[PDB]
Design an enzyme around this catalytic site. Structure first.
Site, PDB file in Angstrom:
ATOM      1  N   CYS A 123      -8.392  -3.576   3.131  1.00  0.00           N
ATOM      2  CA  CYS A 123      -9.107  -4.586   4.211  1.00  0.00           C
ATOM      3  C   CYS A 123     -10.261  -5.000   4.383  1.00  0.00           C
ATOM      4  O   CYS A 123      -9.910  -6.329   4.958  1.00  0.00           O
ATOM      5  CB  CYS A 123      -8.056  -4.119   5.360  1.00  0.00           C
ATOM      6  SG  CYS A 123      -6.551  -3.374   5.095  1.00  0.00           S
ATOM      7  N   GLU A 134     -15.547 -13.532   1.337  1.00  0.00           N
ATOM      8  CA  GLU A 134     -14.119 -12.983  -0.055  1.00  0.00           C
ATOM      9  C   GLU A 134     -13.249 -14.199   0.045  1.00  0.00           C
ATOM     10  O   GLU A 134     -11.885 -14.164  -0.515  1.00  0.00           O
ATOM     11  CB  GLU A 134     -13.321 -12.355   1.656  1.00  0.00           C
ATOM     12  CG  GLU A 134     -11.835 -11.385   0.857  1.00  0.00           C
ATOM     13  CD  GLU A 134     -10.827 -10.632   1.703  1.00  0.00           C
ATOM     14  OE1 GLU A 134     -10.925 -10.917   2.341  1.00  0.00           O
ATOM     15  OE2 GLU A 134     -10.086  -9.722   0.980  1.00  0.00           O
ATOM     16  N   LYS A 157     -15.153 -12.887   6.617  1.00  0.00           N
ATOM     17  CA  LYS A 157     -13.909 -12.899   5.740  1.00  0.00           C
ATOM     18  C   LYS A 157     -14.455 -14.776   4.744  1.00  0.00           C
ATOM     19  O   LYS A 157     -14.065 -14.924   3.976  1.00  0.00           O
ATOM     20  CB  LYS A 157     -12.659 -13.497   5.812  1.00  0.00           C
ATOM     21  CG  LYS A 157     -12.434 -12.861   6.508  1.00  0.00           C
ATOM     22  CD  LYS A 157     -11.594 -11.659   6.261  1.00  0.00           C
ATOM     23  CE  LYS A 157     -11.226 -10.695   6.124  1.00  0.00           C
ATOM     24  NZ  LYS A 157     -10.281  -9.456   5.287  1.00  0.00           N
ATOM     25  N   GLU A 209       0.379  -1.335  -0.411  1.00  0.00           N
ATOM     26  CA  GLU A 209       0.088  -0.031   0.155  1.00  0.00           C
ATOM     27  C   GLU A 209       0.833   0.752   0.134  1.00  0.00           C
ATOM     28  O   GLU A 209       0.422   2.417  -0.545  1.00  0.00           O
ATOM     29  CB  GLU A 209      -0.343   0.090   1.541  1.00  0.00           C
ATOM     30  CG  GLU A 209      -2.026   1.586   1.465  1.00  0.00           C
ATOM     31  CD  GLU A 209      -3.201   1.130   0.181  1.00  0.00           C
ATOM     32  OE1 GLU A 209      -3.492  -0.170  -0.629  1.00  0.00           O
ATOM     33  OE2 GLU A 209      -3.725   1.988  -0.095  1.00  0.00           O
ATOM     34  N   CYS A 269     -11.992  -4.173  13.037  1.00  0.00           N
ATOM     35  CA  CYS A 269     -12.280  -5.651  13.305  1.00  0.00           C
ATOM     36  C   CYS A 269     -12.597  -6.117  14.572  1.00  0.00           C
ATOM     37  O   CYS A 269     -12.998  -7.544  15.267  1.00  0.00           O
ATOM     38  CB  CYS A 269     -10.745  -7.037  12.493  1.00  0.00           C
ATOM     39  SG  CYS A 269     -11.324  -6.093  10.892  1.00  0.00           S
ATOM     40  N   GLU A 288     -12.221 -14.709  -8.544  1.00  0.00           N
ATOM     41  CA  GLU A 288     -11.052 -14.313  -8.704  1.00  0.00           C
ATOM     42  C   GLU A 288     -10.239 -14.466  -7.318  1.00  0.00           C
ATOM     43  O   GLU A 288      -9.457 -13.033  -7.477  1.00  0.00           O
ATOM     44  CB  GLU A 288     -11.047 -12.859  -9.094  1.00  0.00           C
ATOM     45  CG  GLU A 288     -12.314 -11.371  -7.777  1.00  0.00           C
ATOM     46  CD  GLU A 288     -13.280 -10.997  -8.620  1.00  0.00           C
ATOM     47  OE1 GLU A 288     -13.237 -10.578  -9.776  1.00  0.00           O
ATOM     48  OE2 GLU A 288     -14.213 -10.343  -8.116  1.00  0.00           O
ATOM     49  N   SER A 329      -8.164   0.569  -4.203  1.00  0.00           N
ATOM     50  CA  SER A 329      -6.657  -0.004  -4.187  1.00  0.00           C
ATOM     51  C   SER A 329      -6.826  -1.876  -4.268  1.00  0.00           C
ATOM     52  O   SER A 329      -8.038  -2.029  -3.363  1.00  0.00           O
ATOM     53  CB  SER A 329      -5.513   0.625  -2.772  1.00  0.00           C
ATOM     54  OG  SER A 329      -4.513  -0.336  -3.133  1.00  0.00           O
ATOM     55  N   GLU A 348       2.316   1.570  -3.456  1.00  0.00           N
ATOM     56  CA  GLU A 348       0.947   2.391  -3.948  1.00  0.00           C
ATOM     57  C   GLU A 348       1.170   3.639  -4.247  1.00  0.00           C
ATOM     58  O   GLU A 348       0.601   4.671  -5.113  1.00  0.00           O
ATOM     59  CB  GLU A 348      -0.337   1.327  -4.107  1.00  0.00           C
ATOM     60  CG  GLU A 348      -1.557   1.730  -5.109  1.00  0.00           C
ATOM     61  CD  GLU A 348      -1.080   1.148  -6.329  1.00  0.00           C
ATOM     62  OE1 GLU A 348      -0.645  -0.026  -7.003  1.00  0.00           O
ATOM     63  OE2 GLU A 348      -1.627   1.921  -7.518  1.00  0.00           O
TER      64      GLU A 348
HETATM   65  N1  402 Z   1      -7.420  -9.863   6.287  1.00  0.00           N
HETATM   66  C1  402 Z   1      -7.682  -8.982   7.351  1.00  0.00           C
HETATM   67 FE1  402 Z   1      -7.445  -7.932   8.052  1.00  0.00          FE
HETATM   68  C2  402 Z   1      -5.813  -9.083   9.151  1.00  0.00           C
HETATM   69  O1  402 Z   1      -4.924  -8.951   9.954  1.00  0.00           O
HETATM   70  C3  402 Z   1      -8.208  -8.919  10.144  1.00  0.00           C
HETATM   71  O2  402 Z   1      -8.764 -10.167  10.159  1.00  0.00           O
HETATM   72 FE2  402 Z   1      -9.603  -7.723  10.397  1.00  0.00          FE
HETATM   73  C4  402 Z   1      -9.644  -8.074  12.383  1.00  0.00           C
HETATM   74  N2  402 Z   1      -8.966  -8.227  12.852  1.00  0.00           N
HETATM   75  C5  402 Z   1     -11.387  -8.421  10.079  1.00  0.00           C
HETATM   76  O3  402 Z   1     -12.386  -9.193  10.317  1.00  0.00           O
HETATM   77  S1  402 Z   1      -9.070  -7.434   8.190  1.00  0.00           S
HETATM   78  C6  402 Z   1      -9.217  -5.044   7.663  1.00  0.00           C
HETATM   79  N3  402 Z   1      -7.716  -4.826   8.499  1.00  0.00           N
HETATM   80  C7  402 Z   1      -8.064  -4.612   9.977  1.00  0.00           C
HETATM   81  S2  402 Z   1      -7.756  -6.505  10.811  1.00  0.00           S
HETATM   82  S1  SF4 Z   2     -14.960  -7.891  10.828  1.00  0.00           S
HETATM   83 FE1  SF4 Z   2     -15.450  -5.568  10.076  1.00  0.00          FE
HETATM   84  S2  SF4 Z   2     -14.383  -4.451   9.940  1.00  0.00           S
HETATM   85 FE2  SF4 Z   2     -12.965  -5.955   9.869  1.00  0.00          FE
HETATM   86  S3  SF4 Z   2     -13.258  -6.379   7.654  1.00  0.00           S
HETATM   87 FE3  SF4 Z   2     -14.950  -7.479   8.454  1.00  0.00          FE
HETATM   88  S4  SF4 Z   2     -16.319  -6.000   7.906  1.00  0.00           S
HETATM   89 FE4  SF4 Z   2     -15.149  -4.881   7.878  1.00  0.00          FE
END
Ligand code: 402
Ligand code: SF4
Ligand code: SF4
Ligand code: SF4
Ligand code: SF4
Ligand code: SF4
Ligand code: SF4
Ligand code: SF4
Ligand code: SF4
Ligand code: SF4
Ligand code: SF4
Ligand code: SF4
Ligand code: SF4
Ligand code: SF4
Ligand code: SF4
Ligand code: SF4
Lengths: 448, 183, 174, 183
Positions: free
Chosen positions: A178, A240, A237, A158, A382, A245, A198, A161
């Site tokens: 993130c 994701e 997650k 990042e 998070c 992709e 990004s 970038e």
């Molecule tokens: N991938 C990713 Fe991240 C990291 O490491 C996590 O796992 Fe988060 C947490 N805890 C979540 O959900 S996502 C956003 N950025 C901050 S922390």
């Molecule tokens: S736990 Fe919440 S803040 Fe962390 S990536 Fe998932 S939605 Fe975003």
């Protein structure tokens, strides 16, 4: 069907419609609710504000034995069951663990060390990394890694970038990827700004891409029997980890993810206590990290870690910027200005998803130009996601423990990791050098 | 000797969120390893107030702490006693003689198994498996602990702890001011 | 309909005679010795308050044992079946029900009399239907502040006010 | 805000034919199955305005809709409200406490049994027979329905709806014209 609401338990109390950042729940002041799964952003925060817990002393409902099959949870947990339930993945992890053929690797997020200790009757927000890694090794896991490796990798990516994009300004108010919920929301309501975000992957996907290609050569195992499980503190997650992709080398970077509650349930099923466990250490080849990768759990940590190396990449000489106090908070919109390299940066961070819609607008972004803005869908980062356990209804203890863990390490800048230097020397060469663009980046083009 | 207080609901400001029972269950069972966190709860959940919903809305109901309490009088063994200001059941001497369920007209007493130190409590000689001990659960107005936990956990602030002496004075003064302004 | 008693605050000295008479008559009869007529002090005036006999009661609709019932032309508590569930105390608008407890007595001359002289249940004005004389409160009052209103006195007062209004409007200006 | 209109009678043209009470009773009891024909009336007759006679003439009187209404202030339940331009009584919150009869000096309120759906209403728990429910009755200016029905039923047009603001303007204009024509 990932975030569902049971219609035999919901009483229509509407308290879960006051924190939803999309308003994907449709109903009345009475009667059971329902979740519009085609617009839901999977923040997971409609689970922690539910309190209908219908007991099994009456036979008017399901007998609480088939319910654990539908939720996907283990059959030996016997915790109270709520209405707005998260989908379970513990059975598949247990069945894969029982197989003695697959080389198993597990990833730890930088909020598991401060949240799981509350599941065993201890103080709120107690930092136990050694006990956690000892338990994970006792769970018949062949390899245990920290995702903070991917955290430092994505901080370096990042920063590079940002340095590339500040020259020949093209979509200067960029946003970070993130948070998968933010990317899902951007796909949902603003398809015209899919290029502003990004192209950096999440640290979990960073480590997932590293393990399946580079990690197969550090050991003597082929990259086909490896089984990767990531413990992320979020219901965020799972979506994701299965996008078409979001893979490299033909295989999924991570197989499946489990919340902190599922890991606690697995530990309880294994029948091992937590206080007796000794202190251990992570695997050195892919588990070494610095302090800057520790504060991703709390808000403003990603921006601090990115700045800690962007400052050095911009001015090319060390100035102490370890401590910053104008980017700390827990609510609203936070902003700051930084004068570096004869350039001013109007940096900002947003707490929640509904708060970023004002400054996201194409006319509001044309007055301050918003040089760097990150996003967290769940409030206060998070550490308040769907993976954290309920509190029977605080947040400050976990973030204070994370800050203390950050301050107790001897490395602060996210560049002094010898593992990063070795990885750049051996595998990637230079950043953005036709090898990072294959494994460390992805293109967000739903345009639905 | 003075009047005993009793918590009362408010049907205008109640929704049916069931967030007042969970606080009661979590505050009474501190000896069964609860840490204000779901996951440390290894026992089935037993509240003291019960939420009931009908056509004209919903509200919780619980013990009104009667002075000439029928439940205390019918209990031959002597489990129910007016130990403090409120009326409290005793878990040591209860035998499950269900006459209480025929005494209280509100129905604020329910017979459920006991759970001590996180495990079910069994009996000595019964059926070939064992059988759990059954105890009467009802509101004890949080006399052993501090202020009531169903209040301070209601989000809409519907439950109120009323003392039946101050309320009578307030109603009397309201009536007197309403009538004396007209004559 | 129902017979009740009203006290205009113009001629009430707060002399505590009606309260003590109401207590002692019920004591010597064999019922609870506590008064069923409460003296209230306000910012402008002092008036005794008792049970204006509501024709729908809001009392017998909340009693779970069905103790409160309409007898003769009054609302009767039927103390024998009352259990102490403080539910009618919530549903009384004027606050005409108090419970037979020693601490319910405010500090006054009546408390001194009752402590130099010498069950918990809800007590309410029963209009002294057991006594061949009228109500004791209306009879022992030094200034005759209280007065008992019947089913026919209301009609007489309504007709008198209506006729006075009509005659005044006719006489002065149409 | 605007001053509440109130209907008034002219005694010099009224006869006492009692054709104004009947129309009001018919127009307020459409839910009691009346079809503008005697024979479909299975309910005792209850009007809203009341006619009386003295030596110096006959007229009806009704609610004057006082701005600082004593009947609204006396009622502790709060059944009497100003719903629209007029002041109305609510038949759902009335409990029968006759103190509102001790407030109105004009005596336009009468406590009588409620009649709904062609049958007398009965209270739930009273005495062994069931006691009827009694509600207040007074003029409500026919706000829910159309124009006032006491007017357009009087043959002599003695009943008039007055506005207490325009009438003052008319009186002022007449007084000014009378005074200026002399000076
Ligand atoms: N991938 C990713 Fe991240 C990291 O490491 C996590 O796992 Fe988060 C947490 N805890 C979540 O959900 S996502 C956003 N950025 C901050 S922390
Ligand atoms: S736990 Fe919440 S803040 Fe962390 S990536 Fe998932 S939605 Fe975003
Ligand atoms: S998971 Fe989040 S977005 Fe989806 S319904 Fe629940 S609160 Fe709303
Ligand atoms: S919080 Fe739970 S019970 Fe309340 S409306 Fe939402 S899903 Fe239903
Ligand atoms: S069930 Fe228990 S409390 Fe009730 S009467 Fe029997 S022994 Fe007493
Ligand atoms: S259990 Fe029932 S009868 Fe006993 S004191 Fe409570 S409300 Fe009264
Ligand atoms: S007062 Fe205390 S014991 Fe009674 S219901 Fe409320 S929380 Fe439970
Ligand atoms: S917490 Fe309050 S609003 Fe919710 S069910 Fe209980 S009393 Fe009703
Ligand atoms: S007897 Fe009459 S003057 Fe004396 S306190 Fe009673 S109402 Fe007042
Ligand atoms: S206190 Fe007596 S009169 Fe009042 S509701 Fe209870 S039983 Fe009925
Ligand atoms: S106690 Fe109160 S509510 Fe009940 S009848 Fe008497 S005045 Fe009316
Ligand atoms: S009528 Fe009899 S019982 Fe009622 S207040 Fe007067 S003296 Fe007391
Ligand atoms: S009778 Fe009805 S309108 Fe009159 S004061 Fe009582 S509640 Fe109010
Ligand atoms: S009922 Fe009587 S006091 Fe009340 S507003 Fe009408 S005229 Fe005035
Ligand atoms: S205005 Fe309506 S309610 Fe009033 S007297 Fe005339 S018809 Fe009856
Ligand atoms: S209808 Fe007219 S004339 Fe006949 S009694 Fe009524 S006001 Fe008088």
């Amino acid at each position: 069907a990932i975030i569902n609401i049971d219609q035999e338990l919901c009483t229509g109390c509407r308290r879960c419609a006051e924190v939803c950042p999309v308003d994907a729940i449709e109903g009345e002041k009475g009667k059971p609710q329902k979740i519009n799964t085609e617009v839901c952003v999977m923040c997971g925060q409609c689970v922690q504000k539910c309190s209908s817990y219908a007991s099994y002393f009456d036979e008017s409902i399901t007998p609480r034995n088939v319910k654990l099959q539908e939720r996907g949870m283990l059959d030996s947990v016997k915790e109270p069951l709520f209405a707005a339930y998260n989908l379970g993945y513990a059975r598949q992890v247990k069945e894969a663990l029982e197989n003695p053929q697959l080389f198993k690797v597990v990833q730890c997020a930088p909020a598991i060390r401060v949240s799981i200790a509350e599941e065993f009757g201890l103080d709120l927000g107690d930092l136990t990394p050694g006990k956690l890694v000892a338990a994970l090794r006792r769970l018949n896991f062949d390899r245990v890694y920290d995702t903070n490796f991917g955290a430092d990798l994505t901080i370096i990516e990042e920063a590079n970038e940002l340095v590339k994009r500040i020259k020949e300004g093209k979509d200067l108010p960029m946003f970070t990827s993130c948070c998968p919920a933010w990317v899902k929301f951007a796909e949902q309501t603003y398809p015209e700004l899919l290029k502003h975000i990004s192209t950096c992957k999440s640290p979990q996907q960073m480590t997932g891409a590293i393990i399946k290609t580079y990690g197969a050569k550090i050991n003597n195992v082929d990259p086909a029997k490896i089984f990767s499980v990531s413990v992320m503190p979020c219901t965020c997650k799972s979506y994701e980890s299965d996008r078409p992709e979001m893979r490299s080398s033909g295989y999924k970077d991570v197989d499946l993810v489990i919340t902190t509650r599922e890991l606690a349930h697995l530990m309880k099923d294994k029948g091992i206590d937590f206080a007796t466990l000794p202190d251990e250490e992570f695997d050195s080849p892919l588990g070494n990290y610095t302090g800057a990768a520790t504060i991703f759990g709390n808000t403003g940590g990603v921006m601090e870690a990115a700045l800690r190396t962007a400052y050095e990449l911009i001015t090319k000489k060390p100035i102490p910027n370890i401590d910053i106090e104008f980017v700390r908070g827990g609510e609203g919109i936070r902003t700051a200005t930084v004068q570096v390299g004869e350039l001013e940066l109007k940096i900002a961070v947003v707490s929640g998803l509904k708060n970023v819609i004002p400054i996201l607008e194409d006319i509001k972004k044309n007055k301050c130009d918003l040089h760097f803005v990150e996003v967290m869908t769940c409030p206060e980062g998070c550490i308040s996601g769907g993976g954290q356990p309920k509190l029977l209804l605080a947040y400050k203890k976990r973030k204070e423990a994370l800050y203390k863990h950050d301050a107790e390490l001897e490395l602060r800048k996210s560049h002094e990791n010898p593992a990063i230097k070795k990885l750049y020397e051996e595998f990637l060469g230079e950043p953005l050098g036709k090898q990072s663009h294959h494994l460390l980046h992805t293109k967000y083009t739903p345009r639905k | 000797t003075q009047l005993n207080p009793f918590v009362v609901a408010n049907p205008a400001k109640c929704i049916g969120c069931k967030a007042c029972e969970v606080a009661c269950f979590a505050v009474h069972n501190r000896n069964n390893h609860v840490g204000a966190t779901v996951g440390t709860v290894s026992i089935p959940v037993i509240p003291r107030l019960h939420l009931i919903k009908t056509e004209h809305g919903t509200m919780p109901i619980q013990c009104r702490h009667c002075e000439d309490a029928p439940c205390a009088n019918v209990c031959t063994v002597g489990a129910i006693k007016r130990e403090g200001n409120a009326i409290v059941v005793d878990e040591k001497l209860c035998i499950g003689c269900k006459s209480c369920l025929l005494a209280c007209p509100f129905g604020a007493i329910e017979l459920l198994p006991q759970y001590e130190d996180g495990r079910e409590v069994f009996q000595i000689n019964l059926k070939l498996v064992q059988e759990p001990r059954i105890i009467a659960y009802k509101c004890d107005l949080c006399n052993d602990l501090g202020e009531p936990a169903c209040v301070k956990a209601c989000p809409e602030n519907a439950l109120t702890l009323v003392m039946p002496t101050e309320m009578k004075k307030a109603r009397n003064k309201e009536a007197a001011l309403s009538f004396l302004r007209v004559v | 309909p129902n017979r009740f008693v009203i006290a205009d605050p113009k001629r009430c000295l707060g002399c505590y005679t009606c309260i003590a008479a109401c207590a002692f008559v019920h004591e010597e009869q064999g019922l609870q010795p506590f008064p069923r007529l409460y003296l209230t002090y306000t910012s402008e005036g002092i008036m005794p308050i008792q049970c204006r006999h509501c024709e729908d009661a809001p009392c017998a609709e909340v009693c779970p044992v069905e103790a409160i019932k309409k007898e003769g032309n009054a609302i009767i508590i039927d103390e024998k079946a009352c259990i102490g569930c403080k539910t009618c105390l919530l549903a009384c608008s004027f606050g005409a029900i108090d419970f037979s407890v020693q601490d319910s007595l405010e500090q006054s001359i009546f408390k001194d009399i009752k402590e130099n002289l010498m069950r918990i249940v809800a007590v309410k004005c029963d209009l002294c239907n057991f006594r061949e004389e009228g109500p004791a409160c209306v009879q022992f009052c030094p200034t005759k502040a209280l007065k008992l209103v019947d089913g026919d006195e209301i009609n007489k007062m309504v007709k008198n006010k209506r006729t006075v209004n009509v005659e005044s409007l006719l006489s002065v200006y149409g």
